[PDB]
Amino acid sequence: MYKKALHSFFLKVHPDFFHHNRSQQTVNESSVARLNELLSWAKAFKSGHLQPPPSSSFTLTFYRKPDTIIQSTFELPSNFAPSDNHRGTVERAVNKFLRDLLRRAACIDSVTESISEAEDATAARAEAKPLRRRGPKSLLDEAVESMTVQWSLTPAPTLQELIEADQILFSRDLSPLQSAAALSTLQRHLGELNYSAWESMPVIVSNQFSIGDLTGTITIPWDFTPEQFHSFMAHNEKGVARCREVAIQYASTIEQLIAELCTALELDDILVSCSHQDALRLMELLHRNRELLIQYGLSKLTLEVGNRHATRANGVVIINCSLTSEQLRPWLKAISPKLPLQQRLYELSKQMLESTLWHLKEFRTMVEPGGVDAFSNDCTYAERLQWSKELFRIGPSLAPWDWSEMTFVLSPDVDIDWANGLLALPYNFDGDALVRYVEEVQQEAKSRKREELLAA
Amino acid sequence: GREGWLFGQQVQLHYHRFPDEQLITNLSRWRTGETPEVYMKLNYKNPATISRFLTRTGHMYPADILPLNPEAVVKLRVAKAQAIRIGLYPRFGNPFWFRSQKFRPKAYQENYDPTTYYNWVQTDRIRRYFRELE
Amino acid sequence: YAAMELAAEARREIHELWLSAETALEREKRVQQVAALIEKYKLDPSTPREADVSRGLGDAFDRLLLLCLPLGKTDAKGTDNLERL
Amino acid sequence: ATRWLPFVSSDLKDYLNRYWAVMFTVGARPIETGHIRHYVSWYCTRMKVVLLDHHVYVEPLRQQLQEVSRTPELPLLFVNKKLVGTLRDVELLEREKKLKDVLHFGFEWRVGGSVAATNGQKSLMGALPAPYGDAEFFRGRYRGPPVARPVVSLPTLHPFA
Amino acid sequence: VPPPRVLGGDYFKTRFGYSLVKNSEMTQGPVDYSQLDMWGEMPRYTSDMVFLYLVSRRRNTYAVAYTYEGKRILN
Amino acid sequence: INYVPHAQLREHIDKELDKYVAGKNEPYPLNFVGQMPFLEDGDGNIVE
Amino acid sequence: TLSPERVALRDELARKSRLVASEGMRYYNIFWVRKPLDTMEKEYYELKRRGVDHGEAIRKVLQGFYSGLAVKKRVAAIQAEEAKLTGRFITMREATVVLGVLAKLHKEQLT
Amino acid sequence: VFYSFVLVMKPRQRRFTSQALREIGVAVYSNGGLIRSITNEGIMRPYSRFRDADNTPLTYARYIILQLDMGEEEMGKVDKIIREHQDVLMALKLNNLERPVGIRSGNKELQAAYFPLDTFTRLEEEINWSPQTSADIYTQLEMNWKEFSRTRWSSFLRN
Amino acid sequence: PVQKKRQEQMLYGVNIPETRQMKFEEQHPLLAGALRKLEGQPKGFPFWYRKYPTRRHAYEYRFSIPVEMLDGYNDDVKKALSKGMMSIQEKQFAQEAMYMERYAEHD
Amino acid sequence: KASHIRIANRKRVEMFVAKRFHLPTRLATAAPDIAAEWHDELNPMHMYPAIIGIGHVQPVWWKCAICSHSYQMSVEKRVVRGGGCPQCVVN
Ligand SMILES: [Zn+2]
């Protein structure tokens, strides 16, 4: 019935569709949440569970995309009180508010509007003189169901996943104990206050408290009070939105430049280690000097940016952040002759990386160990590939035993820690010898059980 | 020293079963919304897949012990016959057997126990990482 | 990036054109007015890439197809208009 | 009327709905399965044993069994879609003579009091409520026959029995 | 009970009689994909293993010994 | 479906026989059984 | 539960998102994964209300998903890079690992 | 009719192998048929050693997979050619291509509920999957994947 | 089953239900459904369908494929679909179709 | 239920008719001297003296041992009727 109208209304005024205008979005999510709890406790009140109405009267405003504000007011009757006598009029009030929203959004037909108005008028007339009767969804049920199932705001992320996502930072000047307490007492017990606009940037905790900090970040004072934080955000909400914005354009500006650069030089990636501010200067320099790079033959090579002019044996060229326009021409003429060598090494490195990952994956699938760590130790790619090949060779001979507890790792020396579930081997290790040792262990366990049973 | 390495490497607390398991779990959780392609591989080209349903000897298990979809059984049998014909599967024997089993003991046990259902290397990695950090 | 907004603008222009040609008495004005859009938005099949607004014309495509129909007389090679769409 | 097909299902509930008494086991616990088979066959009740080692849907069925039984214990018995438990619970029911009924009719007597501990025929001597209590403050109360106890362990006949 | 802990390569060699580290010629830079053995899961019979077969019967018993290559050593 | 015309048959046969020979830059493919086969220097002689 | 058409496109989207993720992107450490997927399916719903050739519609939403993931990756890179450059604060995870590893080293040196 | 063959050929010189395959293809073409594809499958070691026509066991054999379209009579002609060939130690013929295995025997209701054209149109690699092939590869092919795979080797690349 | 087989031989889409997935798709999607979703030349409505009410009105090609459906494909594909590649079962059906054409009083 | 045997490991035939006719009448068996001349260069690979057998009416290539001439003749003419090399009979 009203499924189409609610679908259109949400498709129009959902916050997810307004990412260009963060102000419109930051009004929309709030209005949507308000409507959500309003309809939720309206349904609860109808089913029973009489409760006082949060914000018994209020106006909600939504923004639209003509590719346009709609404000509607809920004005619960003056004589409202939680009881059966009032149990009927609140439904008609919420239906009036919903019809006003729908009509103003222009996503409901006039005939359906009249249908709902006649429904409410009939209910009001029935209230006086009782009747008897011995189902299709109404506006309230349709709205709550559509909001819940498909048009629902994404739930706020949790603290356990946030700490792992590295969204939270802290100044080391705070002691470990004088840092853990604020998290413990302000996130486990104080996660409810969090506002939707706040989960979009990293949060650092330090002694001070401001918005002047790393790109797209906010700061938090030690043992901050929640209402003090609310006052801060109400005081300079412009600052946090602006910092998020400037951060996202700072990132996206790097992105396009990287993209058309990689396409123009038929290379894959631009990696950065030095400041991205200087990375942008180098990006602009190569932006205006593209064709010169093709002339020199720089192509089909992922480019790495560091602090010292150099080139890694993996084929990446590590470039300095501090460069000028005239001094690069000597640099290009200097590194021109070895460019083909770097390119061939790059291709060989990709081939060996693919082979190593394939072998590690095969060993994981057939000898599932619960963990393999080949890329932690700084060895040569040839050594890592050789170690992966040896593990893959062992493979089935090692299969008959469960290694869900042990973790295979690459080491400069062998260690076999059965208690802590570690198994570290050098790239030069005999798979035959390792199978020998595990078979020795199995034989010892078997003989031990036989001897114990015979003694018993 | 090297400076790209510090910005490349990231510190991990605990190892993963495989590095993308958390992403896969979250993707599956969203796909289910909460808050078999083996008939394609059961053929003469997949010795491991056909061996996944055979005994230690290369023959058939009892129907009660290893019951199957009848189409799966037919495909298994024809694939085994064709592979043995070509010589891609031993005419007697069953490699991939241990590889296919699932209730495997531990290296220091003799039977599978239903109840089962900071390493120095990474410490040194962290030490060298921080040493380069300054 | 501009192709998306251009498809939206073409859709809106077809919306307003459907109203403009709601009392299209003279056949000539309608046929040439609809023909103009073909070249202005380069709807010819020679533009298979994203530049084509046809793939983005989800529903206004049918209205544009229907708009150029009445070709009773004085075709001036009118049928090619229908044939391109 | 139709060809014979071995039954398989990824849902523990399908097994419960289909088979009266169903036991899930593994090949690594032969003795426990043998004991439960001994008890069930002694009470002459049709029972289906399913080995999970080669069963497809092994992980689904295993997690479902673990969540329904609140323990990883592969040898598990089910009657009337309920859990009787592992060999220890089966032995307990055999001890207090409730296993006959849990198998045949599918319910455990909740009467209270043990029937195994008996000197002769089963009667109610010592069941009536005691006025004022104080069953302990009659120091000269009847204490029963002189139960004897072993001095040493008398080594077990077999490591299994 | 998990078995004991072993940490040194030289200690492993001295304790077990066979070095774990290959410690051989470096054949590095090989092909990027390797072929498996026909019987991967089977035990690794090295060159110097004498395979003796003991066949029993009701009245008799035979014993022969073969080289790793299938050559009979003794009648 | 990329059929092999009779004219292109010998060329395709030779180019396909040259698939696992030896001394090659791009990686060798896995055969239909997913097992890398032996390489042959040329004329079908196994070396490695 | 879910409605069958919704679960169908959600399944195809989940597979495609997995492929753009830990596959070629190699972005195992993604954060707040729910928002991108939901905004993409909502955008698909808009494109289907309009009528956008489901194949083309899914291509478009997937490309938008890729762009969002890339910008997220690089903003995370910005914060990590500048936080490491400034030695005053680093992050929480390394604090946990250091405060654990120092205790483990203390125990070892005690042994 | 869509037919497929797996040939196990003794690893002779390249010229001899090419001569054998050329003769087979010439038989196919002179018998009014088409070869959908030919694929050298490398030289492998079968678990059971086939004896040459000289009754010598051969440890190594080259594998060739042929996919072709031929009528039944001339398919039989070329089939006998292949079987009686000198080099072919074995020739496995796939009859299961137009109709998937198991429905002729599986279930009566489903015997006439399949579309032969679905399997006829696609190649043998798409009916019988290798261990390496999985629907992820088909999803990757359906994706453009050019701007998706470009960032794959960065984390390992820098370290 | 006999009647199902011969009904399938006679009629074209008798297998396909209104849901557009015959029984084999439901259990084996990876075989029946097309693996590659190709954007090539999606053909339009067949305006020539009046000519072939049943499979026996087109028996000179494999799978009773009318020639109007083969307009754009390659000569190798047409040869693969020619009579010479026809199977024995479909050849027998073509023999039946000749006499149906000769002696049938209505479609 | 009929039992077959593969002649020269290539041609599967019924065991009865094989033991009675095929085996004793193979070209490399009945007339090895004639099998010697078999032209292994100009003569298709799927035909060789271990299979074709005497009585083959189709002509095949023969390499002469005396004048090293390659001539085309039928196996039945060569073995049964006593065929010979045209150049040799000319000489
Ligand atoms: Zn002569």
Nearest-Å Rg of the Cα atoms of chain B is 23
Of G78, G90, G92, the CB nearest to A250: G78
Measure CA C3 to chain center.
17
Cβ contacts (< 8 Å) between H51 and chain J: which residues?
9
Total CB pairs under 8 A between chain B and I: 5
**Is residue C29 classed as helix, strand or coil in its secondary structure?**
helix
Q: Give the residue among C14, C4, C5 at the shortest CA–CA distance from C63.
A: C14
DSSP per residue, B48-87:
HHHHTTB-TTSSBPPTTTS---HHHHHHHHHHHHHHHHHT
CB atoms within 10 A of CB I27: 15
* G49–chain A Cβ distance below 8 A for any pair: yes
Distance J71 CA to ligand 1 centre (A): 8
Angle between helices A381-398 and A431-455 (to 10 degrees): 30
Whether D and B touch (3+ CB pairs < 8 Å), yes or no: yes
Q: Tell whether the torsion through CA atoms of H128, H130, H131 and H133 is positive or negative.
A: negative
Distance J35 CA to ligand 1 centre (A): 15
β-sheet bridge partners, residue H93: H5
Say how far apart CA H101 and CA A15 lie, in whole Å.
52
Phi-psi region of G93 (alpha: psi -120 to 50; beta: other; left: phi over 0): alpha
Distance J37 CA to ligand 1 centre (A): 10
Distance J40 CA to ligand 1 centre (A): 16
DSSP per residue, A12-71:
HH-GGG--S-HHHHHHHHHHHHHHHHHHHHHHHHHHS-----TTSEEEEEEE-----EEE
Angle between helices G54-85 and G34-50 (to 10 degrees): 150
Say how far apart CA E57 and CA J51 lie, in whole Å.
47
F12, F17, F19, F20 alpha-carbon torsion, rounded to 10°: 180
Task: Please tell me which residue of chain B has the smallest CA distance to A304.
Answer: B4
Q: Position of tokens 């009445």?
A: C70
CB-based burial label for A49 (10 Å; 0-12, 13-18, 19+):
exposed
Contacts of D150 (CB under 8 A, 6+ apart): none
Contacts of G23 (CB under 8 A, 6+ apart): H136, H140, H148, H152
Length of chain F: 48
Q: For residue A260, give how far its alpha carbon lies from the nearest alpha carbon of chain B (Å).
A: 24
* H144–chain A Cβ distance below 8 A for any pair: no
DSSP per residue, A357-395:
HHHHHHHHHHS--S-EESSSS---HHHHHHHHHHHHHHH
Task: Please tell me which residue of chain A has the smallest CA distance to F24.
Answer: A348
CB-based burial label for B55 (10 Å; 0-12, 13-18, 19+):
middle
Contacts of I53 (CB under 8 A, 6+ apart): I107
Cβ contacts (< 8 Å) between I40 and chain F: which residues?
none
Say how far apart CA A140 and CA A87 lie, in whole Å.
14
Say how far apart CA C34 and CA C32 lie, in whole Å.
5
Q: Give the residue among A166, A182, A190, A240 at the shortest CA–CA distance from A210.
A: A240
Resolution rounded to one decimal, in angstroms: 3.3
Cβ contacts (< 8 Å) between J45 and chain H: which residues?
19-20, 23, 85-87
Task: Please tell me which residue of chain H has the smallest CA distance to I16.
Answer: H113
Q: Which two tokens stand for residue A389?
A: 């090949």
**Is residue A409 classed as helix, strand or coil in its secondary structure?**
strand
Say how far apart CA B118 and CA E8 lie, in whole Å.
19
From edge to edge, which strands make up the β-sheet containing A168-170?
A168-170, A203-206, A218-221
CB atoms within 10 A of CB J32: 10
Contacts of I37 (CB under 8 A, 6+ apart): G55, H142
Q: For residue B106, give how far its alpha carbon lies from the nearest alpha carbon of chain E (Å).
A: 9
Say how far apart CA D80 and CA D102 lie, in whole Å.
9
Q: Which two tokens stand for residue A331?
A: 């640099």
Task: Give all chains having 3 or more CB-to-CB distances under 8 Å with chain C.
Answer: G
Cβ contacts (< 8 Å) between B37 and chain I: which residues?
30
Contacts 24+ apart (CB under 8 A), A340-344: A340/A297, A342/A301, A342/A311, A342/A315, A342/A317, A343/A300, A343/A301, A343/A315, A344/A315
